[PDB]
Amino acid sequence: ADEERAETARLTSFIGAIAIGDLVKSTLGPKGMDKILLSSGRDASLMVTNDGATILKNIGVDNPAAKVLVDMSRVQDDEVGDGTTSVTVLAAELLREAESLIAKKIHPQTIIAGWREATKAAREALLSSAVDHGSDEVKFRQDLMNIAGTTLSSKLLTHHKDHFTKLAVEAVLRLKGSGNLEAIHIIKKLGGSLADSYLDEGFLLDKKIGVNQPKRIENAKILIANTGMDTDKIKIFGSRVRVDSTAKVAEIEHAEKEKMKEKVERILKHGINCFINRQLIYNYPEQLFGAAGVMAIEHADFAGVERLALVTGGEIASTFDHPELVKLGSCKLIEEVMIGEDKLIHFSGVALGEACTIVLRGATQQILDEAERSLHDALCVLAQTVKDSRTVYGGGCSEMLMAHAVTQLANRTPGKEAVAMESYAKALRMLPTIIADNAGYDSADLVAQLRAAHSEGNTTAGLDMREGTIGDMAILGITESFQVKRQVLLSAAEAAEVILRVDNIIKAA
């Protein structure tokens, strides 16, 4: 096999991680500038992104350390709901930081152990940088709005974000029980502009059964159901169907009709005003449902079927293990409505008011699918910002706080740790550099200013990267939810060390 030992593998641990840093840091922040995505399998085909996650794929990653961070990115991207491009260069900075120092002969043992509590040293400061915002609801409104445009900013929606910055928080504003991805119903449908993106307050079926079933039913008793009206699922009534003869087609047709008529009548025994079937509904039953004055929605969307059941407070048929036993949803209105260009069956009066159906209106799907995707990312933060309504001063400000904290802790701890911890505290101060370098402004100025600012202990004043000056962190919007940083501050302050442990690297390829 091929063993990459420490130094070489460490330089190899560097090659990807450091160079992967180059782009994701270049894209770091809104004034973070894009990297061309060259598709080497598909033509040369060019793509332009402010996001590193998309970069991690198009040109694949050989470097294991960088290959590791692709997890960390996605991990942080998916879990934190943000910090995609951030946590990555964060591992690039310290490895870069550790380069000369492990090239200074300093053990990663020395290094890792140093950055270990250094990582924790930022925490208490971070835990101190925790700024409760959203504690009040008017806070929570602006608190959500604080981080509403924050996540979508580096998730590469620069246009309709504002329109969603207003939308996404509203759905999250009502929750207040917990940040909810289920009660909140996510719909994105073509028609209208992307600033025409809509919020249905209630459940929504983007399904439309049309007038084939009753379109308008008020105070509608819902049957949330998996119950097959053609396929005819279990608790089956009959003999196992068989064909023994040429003309046998008749009886199987007649045998299923009863089996269909049973679940019709059985679900007609719910008295439900609207039948919602996660499976389809055949001609014989649907003409029975339609003659029963019941709206029968066929093959309704699976999570929505539960979301319907949830938000309308009803129960799902449980695969017709409950013939009558499934509880019934009741919403004051079932109305097929045209929002944008398309008719969707809108359920308002659903039992959950915190529940909101955001109906995203595509001008095209290619932005619309990217819309909700990046839009769903703030929700993670927002949902966890519902749970922890808290903030941390962004723009590298909490950095400079945690910098001094560990920068003094370097001089407070000192030793083989402060060997590493200073290198650590530099990557703390390296974050304010990138966004300012992305913004093309003097970092050593804006850093050592913000240093002097946090040397005066001003974390309410920070690098404000819109204009890219040093300025207030008042929660101008430049402030971040406490969730993100503690999350983003973590995995790279881990993985970089974790990468420092692997030294002998045996590559059997």
Q: Which residues are catalytic?
A: 51, 84-85, 377
Q: How far apart are CA 313 and CA 306, in angstroms?
A: 10
Q: Is 249 in the site for other proteins (CB under 8 A)?
A: no
188 is in an annotated binding site: no
Give the binding range for other proteins (CB under 8 A) out of 105-113, 444-452, 472-480, 487-495.
105-113
> Contacting other proteins (CB under 8 A), which of 217, 310, 317, 500?
500
Pairing, β 185-190 against β 357-362? parallel
Asked whether 427 and 121 are in contact (CB, 8 A), the reply is: no
Q: Is 247 in the site for other proteins (CB under 8 A)?
A: no
Three-state DSSP state, 487: helix
Structure tokens at 302: 């699976």
Smaller CB separation from other proteins, 338 or 474: 338
CB of 418 to other proteins, least distance (A): 12
Asked whether 233 and 286 are in contact (CB, 8 A), the reply is: no
Asked whether 462 and 471 are in contact (CB, 8 A), the reply is: yes
Task: For residue 275, list its beta bridge partners.
Answer: 223, 296
Q: How far apart are CA 109 and CA 7, in angstroms?
A: 14
CB of 79 to other proteins, least distance (A): 14
> Contacting other proteins (CB under 8 A), which of 56, 90, 113, 435?
113
Three-state DSSP state, 206: coil
CB of 428 to other proteins, least distance (A): 19
- 411-417 own/partner pairs: CB under 8 Å, 24+ apart: 413/117, 413/121, 415/114, 416/106, 416/107, 416/110, 416/113, 416/114, 417/110, 417/113, 417/114, 417/117, 417/118
Give the binding range for other proteins (CB under 8 A) out of 128-136, 189-197, 308-316, 500-508.
500-508
Q: Which amino acid is at 147?
A: I
Angle at 373 (CA atoms; ends 372, 378), nearest 5 degrees = 85
Residues 437-456 touching other proteins, rule: CB under 8 A, are 437-440
Q: Is 41 in the site for other proteins (CB under 8 A)?
A: no
Q: Determine whether 318 is exposed, middle or buried from the number of CB atoms within 10 Å of its CB (0-12, 13-18, 19+).
A: middle
> Contacting other proteins (CB under 8 A), which of 42, 138, 239, 246?
239
Q: Is 218 in the site for other proteins (CB under 8 A)?
A: no
SS3 for 119-131 is HHHHHHHHHHHCE
Size of the site for other proteins (CB under 8 A): 50
Q: How far apart are CA 226 and CA 209, in angstroms?
A: 16
Structure tokens at 388: 């922890």
Which H helix or E strand runs over 274?
A: strand 274-277
CB of 271 to other proteins, least distance (A): 25
Pairing, β 357-362 against β 342-348? unpaired
Q: How far apart are CA 431 and CA 21, in angstroms?
A: 12
Residues 58-77 touching other proteins, rule: CB under 8 A, are 62, 64, 67-68
82 is in an annotated binding site: yes
Smaller CB separation from other proteins, 452 or 506: 506
CB of 25 to other proteins, least distance (A): 9
Give the binding range for other proteins (CB under 8 A) out of 188-196, 215-223, 238-246, 484-492.
238-246
**Residues engaged in binding other proteins (CB under 8 A):** 1, 3-6, 9, 22-23, 26-27, 31, 33-36, 38, 43-44, 46, 48, 62, 64, 67-68, 106-110, 113, 239-240, 242, 244, 321, 416, 437-440, 500-509
Binding residues for Mg(2+): 82
Residues contributing to the annotated binding site: 29, 82-86, 153-154, 395, 480, 485
Q: Which residues are annotated as a binding site for ATP?
A: 29, 83-85, 480, 485
In the annotated binding site for ADP, the residues are 29, 83-86, 153-154, 395, 480, 485
